[PDB]
Amino acid sequence: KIEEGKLVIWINGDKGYNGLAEVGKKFEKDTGIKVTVEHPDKLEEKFPQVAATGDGPDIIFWAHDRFGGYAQSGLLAEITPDKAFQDKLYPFTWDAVRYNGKLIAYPIAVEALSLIYNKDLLPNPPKTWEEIPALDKELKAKGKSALMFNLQEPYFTWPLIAADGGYAFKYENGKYDIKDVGVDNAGAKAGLTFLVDLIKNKHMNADTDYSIAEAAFNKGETAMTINGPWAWSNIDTSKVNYGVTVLPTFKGQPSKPFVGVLSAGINAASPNKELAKEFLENYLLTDEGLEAVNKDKPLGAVALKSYEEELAKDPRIAATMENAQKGEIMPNIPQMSAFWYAVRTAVINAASGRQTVDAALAAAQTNAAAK
Amino acid sequence: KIEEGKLVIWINGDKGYNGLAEVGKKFEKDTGIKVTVEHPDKLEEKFPQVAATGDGPDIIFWAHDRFGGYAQSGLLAEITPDKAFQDKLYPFTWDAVRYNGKLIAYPIAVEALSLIYNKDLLPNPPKTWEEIPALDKELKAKGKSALMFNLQEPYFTWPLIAADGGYAFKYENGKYDIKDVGVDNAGAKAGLTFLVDLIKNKHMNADTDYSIAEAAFNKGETAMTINGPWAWSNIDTSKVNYGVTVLPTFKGQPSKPFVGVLSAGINAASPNKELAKEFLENYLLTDEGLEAVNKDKPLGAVALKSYEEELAKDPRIAATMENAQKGEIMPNIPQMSAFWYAVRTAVINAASGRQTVDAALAAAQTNAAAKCNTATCATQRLAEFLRHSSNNFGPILPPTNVG
Ligand SMILES: OC[C@H]1O[C@H](O[C@H]2[C@H](O)[C@@H](O)[C@@H](O)O[C@@H]2CO)[C@H](O)[C@@H](O)[C@@H]1O
């Protein structure tokens, strides 16, 4: 049986299992729990045999595809990494370890075939499969051949077969169910009710608009406001000891703000398309260009890598980045417009007693879904 | 309308439009095309109204959430940035401007609401929403109020609404369709016909297996081969000057290799599930962890963004990761077993001439797509299975190695 207070790990005998023992070691050091790394023969065959009885390793390392049957046989626990951790890994890897919508393993490595060419014999490798016969007829003249690879395993021949539209099984990509809208479920009620309770007790005030908030906070007239980076500069100019922290919790759950990516689109009816492409690529989305905008109003965590690695040292950006990981990125589907529209008049009517919280959110559901 | 040889730019009123205007200065100093930076009210409702007529700005600035609606209205042009430029921007910011497969804008910055407070008025910031009633009563006497944010835009009120269960549209994760298998469709028949043609024209030999191609390449007999990271070590000690690049395209489209993702799963019967979680997330899936494994034996490309950026660099890994991203993830569904032995027979029969390309792939197709569940169709699949169940069971001597 699996021993509590200790980690046993299985991994194939052709992997860097000694280096893994090193890692399990630094772990045993800092926490005082031994980590043994083993590599049994036929481990892909042995694991489901013993893990069914309650035995086996705590962690097992194998190619992701074999994990589907493991999860089918109830041998793998569902994996619970936060959004902060999932960002660290590539998104397609998380798809390789999803079975029945649940994450069942941590991806480690990525494997794929490549074209390997002889620099001496072929310093300019071909870019199209079509130009290999011509290259071969030429290379055959010097007693050589252009291409030789394993033809007896479909793992090696599939890249060519799959190029023009072959596939094993069709994978339906991710999407938003525009018929499953959640603006009148229990959680949405508790939130909006709480906000409308904050005005039934005079703690807030209904027609408080954007400018009233900026003025009142930048006059030491209120203890806190909620806003994004663009409004930081005017609080510098107001000389106020402002801090930027994580949003408060509601019912022990963090506030989930919608995350926007400021974006620049080129109009389709513009005759000056290339000049706009030149302005954004070579003047704005540059280290010097983004700084020009950022010193007017703070941009946030920019998309350009170079400049972001500099602004990331700002503790308030890392606070903004922290709050972004607690929230969701916004969809870009056309129905986003009807959602914002509906929720807007829901919050207002509920906030001014024009409609009850329940009735306002109820009307918001239909308007977000059918329009 | 919009006139040629200028740029009209619309950004929102609360952004840094003066600083953006100065970027139009430098654009007009060097490129001297006039740049007018505007900021109308209700900017995102105004843009599709005028751009439908052919009016509006040249460039429009907003959060990504509106651009798909603009795109479905036929108002935005497809963004055509080259590969060199795409690597300067974070890959997930591009995701925000992808719509129906195409990019429709340039990502600029990530925006998120935060709680900002008044240190000299409040020492420690609160942690719960349910405790501001106390802070407010404690404060209304001292002179002022606690919270005051914009209640006219739902963008500001939403973080609280979503906290306990509110959401816009439930994200339904992607999955496979076991009814839709494509081993005998036009694309597969095209690529396989091309492969068999190489054999017919004696550019390749249908008997070539793994060990032949490795020797022929590691001895300078053939210019190229197709292999994985596991085979690099043998090419090293062969003293062949080899490079590893992207796979050749066919019919203008990239070759799609199967992608294998080495993964660490936690035993469902483990009593140490968080110890495993702490070990994998905080110790192994770091730069130091993967490097310790990679130094013992190469992982190839890794799934950790931070350590993969450093690993390639190595052009062999950069190509391995690029071919992977262009390829097909191995499906983890039980039907893959049929695909594996049916396609294997399919390719061999076609390259050897026993079956036409069309007929070989059609045979593997019905083996992987059930569809028909009458006894005639089921016993046919039963019969084909019992023959790909090769009966060895005897000892393999010497055993496949380990040490
Ligand atoms: O409130 C609805 C509104 O929310 C978002 O707009 C944000 C925008 O992302 C920020 O850059 C800043 O301007 O604050 C705005 C809220 O007033 C959505 O982007 C927008 O589509 C939506 O209408």
Swiss-Prot record, chain B:
Expression induction: Induced by maltose and the transcriptional regulator MalT. Permanently repressed by cold shock in a PNPase-dependent fashion.
> What are the record keywords, sorted?
Periplasm, Signal, Sugar transport, Transport
GO terms, biological process: carbohydrate transport; cell chemotaxis; detection of maltose stimulus; DNA damage response; maltodextrin transmembrane transport; maltose transport
UniProt-listed InterPro entries: Maltose/Cyclodextrin-bd, SBP, SBP_1_CS
Matching CDD domains, A to Z?
PBP2_MBP (cd13656)
Q: What is any one of the record's Gene Ontology cellular component terms? A: ATP-binding cassette (ABC) transporter complex, substrate-binding subunit-containing
* An MF annotation (GO) of this entry: maltose binding
- Where does it live in the cell? Periplasm
Keyword Kinase, does the record have it?
no
Q: How does it assemble?
A: The complex is composed of two ATP-binding proteins (MalK), two transmembrane proteins (MalG and MalF) and a solute-binding protein (MalE).
| Function, as annotated | Part of the ABC transporter complex MalEFGK involved in maltose/maltodextrin import. Binds maltose and higher maltodextrins such as maltotriose.
Q: Which NCBIfam families match?
A: PRK09474.1 (NF007011)
Q: Please report which protein family the annotation says this sequence is part of.
A: Belongs to the bacterial solute-binding protein 1 family.
Q: What is this protein called?
A: Maltose/maltodextrin-binding periplasmic protein
Annotated source species: Escherichia coli (strain K12)
